[PDB]
Design an enzyme around this catalytic site. Structure first.
Site, PDB file in Angstrom:
ATOM      1  N   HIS A  34       7.964 -30.862   7.015  1.00  0.00           N
ATOM      2  CA  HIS A  34       9.316 -30.331   7.068  1.00  0.00           C
ATOM      3  C   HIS A  34      10.273 -31.309   6.406  1.00  0.00           C
ATOM      4  CE1 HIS A  34      13.389 -29.835   8.677  1.00  0.00           C
ATOM      5  NE2 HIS A  34      13.111 -28.549   8.553  1.00  0.00           N
ATOM      6  N   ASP A  44      17.045 -19.700  18.115  1.00  0.00           N
ATOM      7  CA  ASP A  44      17.540 -20.776  17.262  1.00  0.00           C
ATOM      8  C   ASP A  44      18.489 -20.246  16.193  1.00  0.00           C
ATOM      9  OD1 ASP A  44      17.660 -23.342  15.809  1.00  0.00           O
ATOM     10  OD2 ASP A  44      16.450 -22.266  14.325  1.00  0.00           O
ATOM     11  N   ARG A  67      26.855 -22.411  16.308  1.00  0.00           N
ATOM     12  CA  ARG A  67      27.191 -23.820  16.120  1.00  0.00           C
ATOM     13  C   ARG A  67      27.916 -24.001  14.791  1.00  0.00           C
ATOM     14  NH1 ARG A  67      21.650 -26.057  15.559  1.00  0.00           N
ATOM     15  NH2 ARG A  67      22.643 -28.082  15.116  1.00  0.00           N
ATOM     16  N   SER A 107      16.477 -27.604  16.974  1.00  0.00           N
ATOM     17  CA  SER A 107      16.471 -26.475  16.045  1.00  0.00           C
ATOM     18  C   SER A 107      15.267 -26.568  15.103  1.00  0.00           C
ATOM     19  CB  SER A 107      17.767 -26.466  15.228  1.00  0.00           C
ATOM     20  OG  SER A 107      17.742 -25.459  14.230  1.00  0.00           O
ATOM     21  N   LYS A 134      11.314 -24.219  15.492  1.00  0.00           N
ATOM     22  CA  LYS A 134      10.664 -23.436  14.447  1.00  0.00           C
ATOM     23  C   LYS A 134       9.252 -23.958  14.186  1.00  0.00           C
ATOM     24  CE  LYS A 134      14.229 -23.827  11.639  1.00  0.00           C
ATOM     25  NZ  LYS A 134      15.305 -24.098  12.635  1.00  0.00           N
TER      26      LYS A 134
END
Ligand SMILES: [Cl-]
Ligand SMILES: [Cl-]
Lengths: 423, 423
Positions: free
Chosen positions: B81, B160, B167, B182, B186
């Site tokens: 990621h 999320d 947000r 967050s 995922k």
């Protein structure tokens, strides 16, 4: 400034520019800014705080968001407001005393909700009495009678009403700057020059600790001063409701007895203390208060006020016009001395009896209520009546449950001073 | 507990009970809890904080709010990621390498926005390739090919997506616990066992942005540990984009060249660093990464993956299938040594050319882009080509402007390591 930018500014503990603060809040007023952005800002303001200037700007922006009264042409316009508590009847005595002392006591009162009472609800117990009136009638009676109590209080500082409703469902109520600006916004809009605030002090809900109360008092005084108003706060204890009557018609009865010089000592003490502070702010001799009360001039003003707003002046002499429900004695199941009578719980009892409203706008039963026979300091023997409950055969069991819980007995009682200090 | 009490609890800096946090959020997902109450809570969490367990519970709650992919039957499921940065092409190389080293690289990628690029957009430049597929197809390809990249869907961690959108309009994005939960929610929903994080510092002073990147990495590793997943973070520098190509078709061309052993050294170094960390987390021999790359297995794997998802595998051998627009050289109007090539400004250049989208969902042009000929440390002589610009006669002037600004030259340069540290 963008709304997200405005929220972020406070989130980071920065001070706002009055121009941006007003734009944000007024955007909310016109429904241009979503409730979720305002709640985020409220939480940031609650946690990062607002300084004296920001607090004043917030107060003024809300004060100008709706109806605004100009009492500059009237003699010594004063007002009284309560911070904390469950909505007592002290104003029904303070108003008449001040009006009979050369002041103009023209204000708008609210209605109760749940455990809290409201002066407008209490007065509607009087047959014929109406709080609704035009702007012209309000000013006319203020000039002629000197004492006017109008409904539609919400018409003053609508932005505050809107912001308060949001604070109430987002846990952003209990913030000194937000509480102070809320209260003062309505007072600035109402137009009185001198404002006396009664702040309840204690440990529990609807009460502020001494430290919190002093901070709140100092903040409201600063706001008033910054807006050219004269403000004085009187901190008082609340180990029990003031007086003995809790409800509506029953409270009007008590206020009348007080004005006749036959009322409870504690109620009289606080009413005079508040009236005296108002007089001092206006540069008037505080001695005028007790004079107006003991001489009957205050009762005369109250009677003229009721009559001027449609109420039957006969109610002052004949309590038959202020009927109560069925009487039931609440008997003590213990031996001891009363140390406390939880005002919150007494209010819950009145609510259960139908003397309060669970939903805004609902009517109420003005004849039910409670009459406290034993107050802190009093010795009570088992089986002796603690209180009298006036019911309409509705929720009596729940009411008695709350009333019993409200009473706290012991071997000894050291009742705290009623009036703590003035700020 | 009621929503108002939940908000008040965080406002006071107290720690939530797992069950209450789940109830509040799931209530929000089902539209039973208003947005203004959730934003009030978000601001309280932002300012008062969430401890390690709360952060974990928040992550877990969002992770299971929708579909949860099961990869337990597949060999060594891993993923990478990218946090921060402008969305580079490292995955186009890391995925094939790991899939060719015995791991399963099955993940969900996204699209670019503004100055950032996205893996889904890049791969769509290969004619026929698409990231939309059923759960059944996803698992079948993961098992048969070992490399699958699908377009993200609201099916995974829908809580999320809902929370992030709120947000983003309430100034509550920039909180490590919220950012970390967050990203990890995922990843947990996607099912990989080992996750390697490529973390780039945000925009601003290096001491502060590095501090934040380090805290984010530490936090995500903690969540992973608490969730039973293996996580390792590598903080990478960004003195210039990775490799030379920035765009879409142009980036796939470079990834292919890198897989053929003819790509830029920097891209290769970072790709191998990330692949090696993933292999270590899975208890496999890190040396397999370089072997997969140099032996050609990664290239064959990438080709099989393109074909499996509808793309023309011939694109690997014939770049006429990955056409570029009109070429225009950006020549230096000064001499010196390149010290930096602002990746954000290069991204704005590609956006101006139409290679990026101004708003979510808008189509992009796969043939435009930039090819950097000079990188940090390279000497530049006046008139020498700094980069090649591929345009379709739109936004060229603006693009060249962003590119010239992107380039920072000096008398000397001392490029920092491509990977700053590990956590
Ligand atoms: Cl609150
Ligand atoms: Cl933010």
């Amino acid at each position: 400034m963008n709304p997200v930018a405005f929220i972020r500014e406070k989130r980071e503990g920065k001070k706002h520019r009055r121009e941006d603060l007003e734009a944000f809040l007024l955007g909310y007023l016109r429904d241009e800014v979503p409730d979720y952005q305002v709640s985020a800002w409220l939480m940031a303001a609650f946690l990062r705080g607002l300084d004296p200037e920001e607090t004043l700007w917030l107060t003024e922006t809300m004060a100008r968001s709706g109806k605004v009264l100009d009492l500059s042409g009237l003699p010594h316009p004063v007002d009284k407001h309560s911070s904390g508590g469950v909505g007592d009847k002290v104003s029904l005595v303070v108003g008449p005393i001040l009006a009979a002392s050369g002041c103009t006591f023209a204000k708008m009162s609210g209605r109760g909700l749940a455990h809290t009472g409201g002066t407008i609800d209490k007065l509607e117990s009087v047959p014929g009495w109406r709080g609704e009136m035009t702007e012209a009638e309000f000013l006319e009676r203020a000039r002629r009678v000197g004492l006017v109590i109008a409904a539609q209080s919400p018409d003053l500082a609508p932005l505050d009403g809107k912001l308060y409703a949001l604070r109430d469902v987002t846990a952003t109520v209990e913030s000194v700057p937000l509480i102070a600006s809320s209260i003062m916004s309505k007072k600035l809009a109402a137009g009185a020059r001198s404002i006396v605030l009664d702040v309840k002090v204690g440990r529990g809900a609807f009460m502020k600790t001494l430290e919190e109360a002093r901070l709140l008092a100092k903040t409201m005084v600063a706001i008033g001063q910054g807006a050219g108003r004269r403000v004085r706060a009187l901190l008082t204890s609340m180990e029990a409701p003031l007086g003995r009557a809790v409800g509506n018609a029953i409270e009007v009865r008590e206020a009348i007895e007080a004005l006749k010089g036959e009322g409870p000592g504690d109620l009289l003490e606080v009413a005079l203390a508040l009236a005296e502070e108002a007089l001092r702010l206006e540069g008037l001799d505080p001695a005028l208060a007790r004079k107006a009360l003991e001489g009957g001039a205050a009762l005369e003003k109250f009677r003229a006020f009721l009559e001027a707003q449609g109420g039957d002046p006969r109610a002052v002499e004949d309590f038959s016009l202020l009927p109560l429900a069925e009487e039931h004695p609440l008997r003590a199941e213990r031996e001891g001395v009363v140390r406390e009578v939880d005002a919150y719980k007494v209010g819950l009892a009145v609510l259960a009896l139908g003397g309060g409203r669970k939903r805004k706008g609902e009517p109420i039963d003005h004849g039910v209520g409670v009459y406290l026979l034993k107050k802190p300091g009093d010795r009570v023997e088992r089986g002796e009546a603690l209180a009298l409950v006036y019911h309409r055969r509705r929720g009596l069991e729940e009411a008695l449950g709350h009333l019993r819980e409200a009473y706290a007995l012991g071997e000894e009682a050291h009742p705290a001073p009623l009036v703590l200090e003035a700020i």
